[PDB]
DNA sequence: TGAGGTAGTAGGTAGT
């Protein structure tokens, strides 16, 4: 809806830029030996770095804010194995106007230098690249939380300097991977170098000798640390083999005594809380964008209104207008089918729960399809049988089994599906301590248990710029040669696609795929495709792709999606609401897509359209509702739109339960939610 | 396993 809405953004403008800062110093640059055209703005940045003060690279050369004797005019650094010999020569000043696109990057590149340079020398502050830490959090053995704000400062073409504050925590692992060990915690799934900042895939532990392991050179692991001077201050351990994160299948030799590990939330299991209310954080950012002005000298800070556009709230419905997925069950859905569910009452009595039979039947009358319950007689322990029994079912049109179990221990859940899931059965689990009354819980098994049987419970009903939205995941990586899985969403349809080495290939083919699933269903190829990835993926990973699609007449929107550290919203009067849609940069925009975000403050997705030609209220819009468009979890909508948020669970069960691949599990259904 | 939000993590052809 046009003209709806205004909102505080987490910025603050700042003082303008005075006159000298309008035409920083221009350094020219002397490599020796000349670099190669691909070597030299690594080297130049390098440099601007040797250098010190406010200095960045601009062209060939440098600029800075700071006066050309600040800077070390002369120096040397080795990159990549071979020396070089710098050497600067101050040219004279040189102005850039913020109103270019071009000179206007070189200023806000100043400027961030600046924010980190005036910053670092602050006492009483860890300052980690564009983010300050004034504070301990919480601490434990081996691991601290510290407290501070992630900052960025950047020059507006209006030309004044603009400060984004958002407040945040940092986990710290404060010992060695294998003081950590030692203390029985799982081995880390990232660790890092002890004596630098690389990062490396952490994979197994060896019972290999430290003294036996030779390297490429005949030297050995032990010896070769020990030539780095590594060993000097550290206590080598074992053999912990790594990887590279650029080529993870490459096992790597280490020292678990040279390593750190790389603490996620997940590995402080049991309590720190890290949310914060929206008006206690609102407060604490405040309070920090005007501490950053003071001390930097910045004058004092204006918090950023933006427009924002309410976009219309979904019309999803089931055979009826429903409200919440959940209100299917009741009023009957959009897309039925023939089709026969079996339980599993694998620790109890037997016979189906009085409500369930009932409201099993109360949906498919109220949608007029035929349902057929069986019953599995079987178990673990009559293995032979058990499959004996599940062949036999399956055989028999069963198309889902509902496993009525006891709280399961986690190992034996995997196992248990994964037995299932071969012979042809998706599973729902519904612990068994059991009451009607909580029809909540009963209600949302019974919802995937319909959606793993391939039925859909709900669709849209719209005219959205896409006829199909397919969103990509690659597990927690930042790359698709590992491993990476998608999810489509179209006539509604749902559709998994998993992977059949290049990256570009790999999405190629998840696409063509899903293009081939998506013919098969609909009787037709979409004439336009939505694509939805995790922004924190090179953008060339989808290429191939889009030639492709191009190739074939196919239209597309590719639109990078970034789930973390977009930036904040805050209502100026009143309250926030549902698919606030905030444009805010040349192709980026903010969406909020759940209000009641929790005990903290909603975190709105960072949306950027870098391919196609739609109007970005259009994607916003359809996105928006791609969101209510989630078949399990019929009480709550997802912060993500139904593609990606499909397509985290389709990877994190794939390795849950390892499978390599399903031959077939018809793809409408939905085994993973 | 009923499900979801907030929160933080990957720094944002050598080396071992
Ligand atoms: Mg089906
Ligand atoms: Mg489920």
């Not at 403008?13 to 670099?35: Q, T, Y």
């Not at 650094?77 to 070089?84: D, E, K, P, S, V």
């Not at 053999?239 to 030799?253: E, F, L, S, T």
């Not at 791609?626 to 993500?640: D, I, M, N, V």
Request: net charge positive; aromatic share 8%.
């Amino acid at each position: 809806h046009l003209g709806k809405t205004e909102v505080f953004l987490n910025r603050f403008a700042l003082r303008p830029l005075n006159p000298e800062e309008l035409r920083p110093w221009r350094l020219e640059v002397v490599l020796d030996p000349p670099p190669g055209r691909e070597e030299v703005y690594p080297l130049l940045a390098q440099v601007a770095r040797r250098a010190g003060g406010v200095t960045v690279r601009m062209g060939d050369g440098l600029a800075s804010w700071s006066p050309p004797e600040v800077l070390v005019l002369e120096g040397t650094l080795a990159r990549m194995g071979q020396t070089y010999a710098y050497r600067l020569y101050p040219k004279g000043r040189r102005p850039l106007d913020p109103k270019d696109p071009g000179e206007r990057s070189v200023l806000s590149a100043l400027a961030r230098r600046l924010l980190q340079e005036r910053l670092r020398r602050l006492e009483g502050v860890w300052v980690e690249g564009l983010a300050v830490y004034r504070r301990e959090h919480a601490r434990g053995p081996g691991w601290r939380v510290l407290g501070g704000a992630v900052l960025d400062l950047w020059v507006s073409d209006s030309g004044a300097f603009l400060l984004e504050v958002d407040p945040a925590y940092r986990i710290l692992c404060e010992m060695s991977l294998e003081a950590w060990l030692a203390q029985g915690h799982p081995l880390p799934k990232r660790v890092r170098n002890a004596y630098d900042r690389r990062t490396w895939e952490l994979l197994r532990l060896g019972e290999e000798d430290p003294k036996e392991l030779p390297l490429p050179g005949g030297l050995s692991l032990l010896d070769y640390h020990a030539s780095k001077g590594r060993l000097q201050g550290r206590e080598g351990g074992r053999v912990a083999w790594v990887a590279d994160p650029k080529d993870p299948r490459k096992p790597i030799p280490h020292l678990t005594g040279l390593l750190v590990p790389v603490l996620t939330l997940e590995d402080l299991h049991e309590s720190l809380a890290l949310s914060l209310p929206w008006e206690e954080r609102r407060r604490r950012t405040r309070e920090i964008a005007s501490w950053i002005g003071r001390r930097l000298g910045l004058g004092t800070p204006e918090a950023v209104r933006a427009q924002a556009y309410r976009l219309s709230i979904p019309k999803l419905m089931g055979r009826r207008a429903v409200s919440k997925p959940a209100d299917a069950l009741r009023v009957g859905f959009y897309r039925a089918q023939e089709t026969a569910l079996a339980l599993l009452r694998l620790d109890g009595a037997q016979g189906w729960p009085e409500f369930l039979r009932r409201a099993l039947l109360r949906a498919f009358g109220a949608s007029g399809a035929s349902l057929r319950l069986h019953t599995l007689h079987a178990h673990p322990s009559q293995g032979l049988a058990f499959r004996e029994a599940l062949r036999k079912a399956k055989e028999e049109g069963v198309q889902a089994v509902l496993v009525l179990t006891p709280p399961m221990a986690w190992e034996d859940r995997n196992r248990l599906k994964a037995l299932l899931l071969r012979e042809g059965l998706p599973s729902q689990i519904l612990n068994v301590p059991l009451r009607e009354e909580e029809r909540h819980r009963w209600e949302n098994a019974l919802l995937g248990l319909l959606a793993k049987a391939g039925l859909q419970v709900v669709a849209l009903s719209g005219a959205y710029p896409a006829e199909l939205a397919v969103g990509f995941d690659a597990g927690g990586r930042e790359s698709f040669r590992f491993g990476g899985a998608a999810c489509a969403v179209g006539g509604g349809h749902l559709l998994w696609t998993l992977p059949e080495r290049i990256p570009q290939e790999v999405v190629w083919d998840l696409l063509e795929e899903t293009l081939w699933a998506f013919r098969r269903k609909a009787g037709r190829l979409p004439s336009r495709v939505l694509l939805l990835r995790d922004g924190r993926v090179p953008q060339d990973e989808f290429a191939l792709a889009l030639e492709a699609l191009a190739r074939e007449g196919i239209a597309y929107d590719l639109v990078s999606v970034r789930k973390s550290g977009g930036g904040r919203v805050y209502p100026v009067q009143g309250r926030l609401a549902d698919g606030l849609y905030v444009p805010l940069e040349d192709k980026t925009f903010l969406l909020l897509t759940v209000h009641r975000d929790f005990r903290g403050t909603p975190r709105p997705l960072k949306l950027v359209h870098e391919a196609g030609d739609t109007p970005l209220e259009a994607l916003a819009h359809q996105i928006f509702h791609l969101t209510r468009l989630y078949p399990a979890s019929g009480f709550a909508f997802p912060r993500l739109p139904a593609p990606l948020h499909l397509a985290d669970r389709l990877v994190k069960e794939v390795g849950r339960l390892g499978i390599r691949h399903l031959k077939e599990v018809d793809r409408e259904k939905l085994f993973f939610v």
